[PDB]
Amino acid sequence: GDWSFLGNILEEVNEHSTVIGRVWLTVLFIFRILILGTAADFVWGDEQSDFVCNTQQPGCENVCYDEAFPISHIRLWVLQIIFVSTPSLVYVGHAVLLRTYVCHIIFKTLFEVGFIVGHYFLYGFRILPLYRCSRWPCPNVVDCFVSRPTEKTIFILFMLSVASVSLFLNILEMSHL
Template structure:
């Protein structure tokens, strides 16, 4: 946002202030070439061109970062189907976390480069121009015959604009430092969280290895066979088939007769058997 504000200042205000900076720079001499040499000594680089060069270099890391993000978005759209398959297999979370950490790291590098350029241009502006544009500049450079006085146009307006641009650059640098401070804590927190998740996550390979070892171990097989032999009933009849309704068949009736009672019943005559039959209308005595 401040970059756009700086561009608007240079294009709208700076052009009007510095449009006549060399044509109105006059020296009290008629020596050919003295005016040009004195102006070059006064301003090795024009204020306006210095700020344009600063805007271009400071915005270069941001432009590269935007190009990288756009390329990554296009690549993610092409690989959307592959990511869906990886999500089904359970490997999408780690890949997305790695991609997020990579984008965050590139953003931090871009902010660091931008901050270094800002501080470099601040130091350069201070050594080239200082904080004040003088009304009178004394020049003693060849081919001027002696000490020559040169006069600068719109000195007060240029001083205000110079300090204002210095303040804008300083504000951008402070914002970059604050952003680095915030992103540094965020990146550290993410690294710690990813390390903790990697330590606490169970390893699938170890669980599979334990399962294969337990299934293929001869000791485990021998123990299972011995348990089956102990639990199996010798001479047990096969279980009756279940009815289609899902109910088990009724158990066979339990006979309460012994060998002696069977002999007695067989030795009885027809009359005794007739007496033993239950008559309708009479109550049946229970066996108690």
């Protein structure tokens, strides 16, 4: 994706970040961005094309998809990566002080916590192959099916553990400093 400029700015930040902070930044780039672009994008690229429902109603398919997946997991992770990354960028902008660092890491922690709990609220880290829905065009609660469920929950769990690791790094850095 169009990640060159952000990568440039964050690589500039890597000079001023703490050693643990460098580890966190590398966790971000190596895992969240690389996996999201390289692997996840191809997984979810056929999220709606292969979402075949049972009824031959015309509109039930995309409506029931929308209900099942209000926002796609990739989108939520793009927003999450950006939101969690942004405090670091704000801090370098100030640098280009310690209280600012504490505030920015706390923001990262709180936003990433908000994202893992919101994601759990929408889907509890376990896509199921089946979704029975009852939107208006869909008659009598038709059962619709999902594409690559297992692989999608694998990446969900993976990225959730990555976010938990980022939280561990941030709070341990906090208590440390």
